[PDB]
Amino acid sequence: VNTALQEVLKTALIHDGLARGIREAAKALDKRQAHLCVLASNCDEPMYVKLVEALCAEHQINLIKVDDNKKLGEWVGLCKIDREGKPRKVVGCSCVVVKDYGKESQAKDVIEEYFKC
Amino acid sequence: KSYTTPKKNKHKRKKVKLAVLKYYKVDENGKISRLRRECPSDECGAGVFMASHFDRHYCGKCCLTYCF
Ligand SMILES: [Zn+2]
């Protein structure tokens, strides 16, 4: 499902279906428009983890677990430059709401049937 | 350079850490409890709050002050 997360992240990047920022995510949950969510767990935070699934696991919310903050940040491309090597300075992101409108693809039905059960 | 007249510095906004702690109250139950009054203006969304003064609240870029 990692390649499904990769293709839905590149779909969000190519269709502007991403709203990076946890207060933008809180606004998305408050405006009743959240479809897919990505969660970061077992990372370096004393009190942030309790608030992040407290404000994530409300209703009709998918659960994706990421081991490290920086690996999701490198994946989402906060500073995606210099592809002949590595990105220079990317911080670790934790939560993002994928408000994508692109639906007709290959792995979209697969990830929707995986998350429907 | 250093002139004769003094100059007031610009409004350097102090960084406040863990602000997402101070928006909702979390209990054993999963139901949230907002601590700030919500702005009903259509220019801003339903996720925004109001400012926390000591007499009455204050909206965001709407700049609308509501009394009691
Ligand atoms: Zn407003």
Side-chain angles (χ1 to χ4, degrees), chain B residues 39-45 48-50 59-64 66:
Chain B
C39 189
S41 302
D42 303 334
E43 314 168 357
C44 48
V48 299
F49 316 122
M50 293 180 183
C59 183
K61 218 61 69 185
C62 295
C63 303
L64 310 173
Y66 301 95

mmCIF file of all heavy atoms in Angstrom, chain B residues 39-45 48-50 59-64 66, ligand 1:
data_model
loop_
_atom_site.group_PDB
_atom_site.id
_atom_site.type_symbol
_atom_site.label_atom_id
_atom_site.label_comp_id
_atom_site.label_asym_id
_atom_site.label_seq_id
_atom_site.Cartn_x
_atom_site.Cartn_y
_atom_site.Cartn_z
ATOM 1 N N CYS B 39 -16.527 32.377 14.809
ATOM 2 C CA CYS B 39 -16.888 33.507 13.964
ATOM 3 C C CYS B 39 -17.920 33.067 12.935
ATOM 4 O O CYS B 39 -17.623 32.187 12.116
ATOM 5 C CB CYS B 39 -15.659 34.065 13.263
ATOM 6 S SG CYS B 39 -15.918 35.627 12.380
ATOM 7 N N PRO B 40 -19.124 33.637 12.934
ATOM 8 C CA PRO B 40 -20.157 33.230 11.971
ATOM 9 C C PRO B 40 -20.128 33.967 10.638
ATOM 10 O O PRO B 40 -21.068 33.807 9.854
ATOM 11 C CB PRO B 40 -21.449 33.560 12.729
ATOM 12 C CG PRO B 40 -21.091 34.764 13.536
ATOM 13 C CD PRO B 40 -19.632 34.626 13.904
ATOM 14 N N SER B 41 -19.095 34.760 10.363
ATOM 15 C CA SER B 41 -19.023 35.491 9.105
ATOM 16 C C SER B 41 -18.678 34.554 7.954
ATOM 17 O O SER B 41 -17.934 33.584 8.121
ATOM 18 C CB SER B 41 -17.988 36.610 9.200
ATOM 19 O OG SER B 41 -18.299 37.504 10.255
ATOM 20 N N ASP B 42 -19.225 34.855 6.775
ATOM 21 C CA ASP B 42 -19.027 34.012 5.602
ATOM 22 C C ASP B 42 -17.681 34.229 4.923
ATOM 23 O O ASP B 42 -17.316 33.430 4.053
ATOM 24 C CB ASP B 42 -20.151 34.248 4.588
ATOM 25 C CG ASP B 42 -21.528 34.000 5.175
ATOM 26 O OD1 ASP B 42 -21.632 33.210 6.136
ATOM 27 O OD2 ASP B 42 -22.504 34.593 4.672
ATOM 28 N N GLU B 43 -16.947 35.289 5.279
ATOM 29 C CA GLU B 43 -15.622 35.496 4.700
ATOM 30 C C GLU B 43 -14.627 34.461 5.208
ATOM 31 O O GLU B 43 -13.811 33.944 4.436
ATOM 32 C CB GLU B 43 -15.125 36.907 5.011
ATOM 33 C CG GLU B 43 -16.151 37.999 4.780
ATOM 34 C CD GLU B 43 -15.722 39.325 5.371
ATOM 35 O OE1 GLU B 43 -14.647 39.373 6.005
ATOM 36 O OE2 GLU B 43 -16.459 40.319 5.201
ATOM 37 N N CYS B 44 -14.679 34.149 6.497
ATOM 38 C CA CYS B 44 -13.850 33.111 7.088
ATOM 39 C C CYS B 44 -14.654 31.823 7.239
ATOM 40 O O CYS B 44 -15.870 31.789 7.041
ATOM 41 C CB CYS B 44 -13.291 33.571 8.440
ATOM 42 S SG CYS B 44 -14.506 34.301 9.568
ATOM 43 N N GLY B 45 -13.950 30.748 7.589
ATOM 44 C CA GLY B 45 -14.553 29.439 7.710
ATOM 45 C C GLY B 45 -15.145 29.194 9.085
ATOM 46 O O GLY B 45 -15.231 30.083 9.933
ATOM 47 N N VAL B 48 -12.148 28.672 12.212
ATOM 48 C CA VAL B 48 -11.448 29.770 12.864
ATOM 49 C C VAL B 48 -12.138 30.116 14.179
ATOM 50 O O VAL B 48 -13.311 29.806 14.405
ATOM 51 C CB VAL B 48 -11.352 31.000 11.942
ATOM 52 C CG1 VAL B 48 -10.569 30.660 10.682
ATOM 53 C CG2 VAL B 48 -12.735 31.522 11.597
ATOM 54 N N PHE B 49 -11.390 30.773 15.056
ATOM 55 C CA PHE B 49 -11.842 31.147 16.389
ATOM 56 C C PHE B 49 -11.836 32.669 16.502
ATOM 57 O O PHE B 49 -11.707 33.382 15.504
ATOM 58 C CB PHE B 49 -10.961 30.493 17.455
ATOM 59 C CG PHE B 49 -10.654 29.049 17.186
ATOM 60 C CD1 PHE B 49 -9.341 28.617 17.071
ATOM 61 C CD2 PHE B 49 -11.678 28.122 17.041
ATOM 62 C CE1 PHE B 49 -9.051 27.287 16.820
ATOM 63 C CE2 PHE B 49 -11.396 26.790 16.790
ATOM 64 C CZ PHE B 49 -10.080 26.373 16.680
ATOM 65 N N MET B 50 -12.014 33.166 17.721
ATOM 66 C CA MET B 50 -11.873 34.584 18.014
ATOM 67 C C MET B 50 -10.711 34.819 18.971
ATOM 68 O O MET B 50 -10.216 33.897 19.625
ATOM 69 C CB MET B 50 -13.162 35.166 18.603
ATOM 70 C CG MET B 50 -14.328 35.210 17.630
ATOM 71 S SD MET B 50 -15.813 35.899 18.382
ATOM 72 C CE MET B 50 -16.989 35.726 17.045
ATOM 73 N N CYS B 59 -12.716 39.053 16.154
ATOM 74 C CA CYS B 59 -12.633 38.141 15.018
ATOM 75 C C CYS B 59 -11.287 38.301 14.308
ATOM 76 O O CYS B 59 -10.432 39.094 14.709
ATOM 77 C CB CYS B 59 -13.807 38.374 14.070
ATOM 78 S SG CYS B 59 -13.885 37.245 12.649
ATOM 79 N N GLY B 60 -11.100 37.572 13.211
ATOM 80 C CA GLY B 60 -9.822 37.545 12.523
ATOM 81 C C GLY B 60 -9.654 38.674 11.530
ATOM 82 O O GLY B 60 -9.679 39.848 11.910
ATOM 83 N N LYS B 61 -9.474 38.332 10.252
ATOM 84 C CA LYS B 61 -9.393 39.341 9.201
ATOM 85 C C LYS B 61 -10.729 40.028 8.937
ATOM 86 O O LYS B 61 -10.753 41.041 8.231
ATOM 87 C CB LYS B 61 -8.867 38.713 7.908
ATOM 88 C CG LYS B 61 -7.926 39.612 7.120
ATOM 89 C CD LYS B 61 -6.688 39.969 7.930
ATOM 90 C CE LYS B 61 -5.787 38.759 8.129
ATOM 91 N NZ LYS B 61 -4.629 39.058 9.017
ATOM 92 N N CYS B 62 -11.831 39.491 9.473
ATOM 93 C CA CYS B 62 -13.115 40.178 9.426
ATOM 94 C C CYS B 62 -13.082 41.477 10.224
ATOM 95 O O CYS B 62 -13.751 42.448 9.846
ATOM 96 C CB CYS B 62 -14.210 39.257 9.964
ATOM 97 S SG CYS B 62 -14.515 37.782 8.962
ATOM 98 N N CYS B 63 -12.311 41.497 11.325
ATOM 99 C CA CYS B 63 -12.123 42.658 12.211
ATOM 100 C C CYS B 63 -13.446 43.169 12.778
ATOM 101 O O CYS B 63 -13.661 44.375 12.916
ATOM 102 C CB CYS B 63 -11.355 43.786 11.512
ATOM 103 S SG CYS B 63 -9.733 43.301 10.878
ATOM 104 N N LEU B 64 -14.338 42.242 13.111
ATOM 105 C CA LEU B 64 -15.650 42.568 13.649
ATOM 106 C C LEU B 64 -15.663 42.277 15.144
ATOM 107 O O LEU B 64 -15.357 41.156 15.565
ATOM 108 C CB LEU B 64 -16.743 41.775 12.932
ATOM 109 C CG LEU B 64 -16.698 41.823 11.403
ATOM 110 C CD1 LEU B 64 -17.716 40.867 10.796
ATOM 111 C CD2 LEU B 64 -16.925 43.243 10.908
ATOM 112 N N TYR B 66 -17.842 41.946 18.534
ATOM 113 C CA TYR B 66 -19.198 41.657 18.981
ATOM 114 C C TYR B 66 -19.293 41.871 20.485
ATOM 115 O O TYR B 66 -18.476 41.340 21.245
ATOM 116 C CB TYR B 66 -19.602 40.225 18.624
ATOM 117 C CG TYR B 66 -19.560 39.923 17.142
ATOM 118 C CD1 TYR B 66 -18.436 39.343 16.563
ATOM 119 C CD2 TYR B 66 -20.647 40.211 16.325
ATOM 120 C CE1 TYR B 66 -18.394 39.063 15.208
ATOM 121 C CE2 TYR B 66 -20.615 39.935 14.969
ATOM 122 C CZ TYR B 66 -19.486 39.361 14.418
ATOM 123 O OH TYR B 66 -19.449 39.084 13.070
HETATM 124 ZN ZN ZN C 1 -14.550 36.296 10.679
#
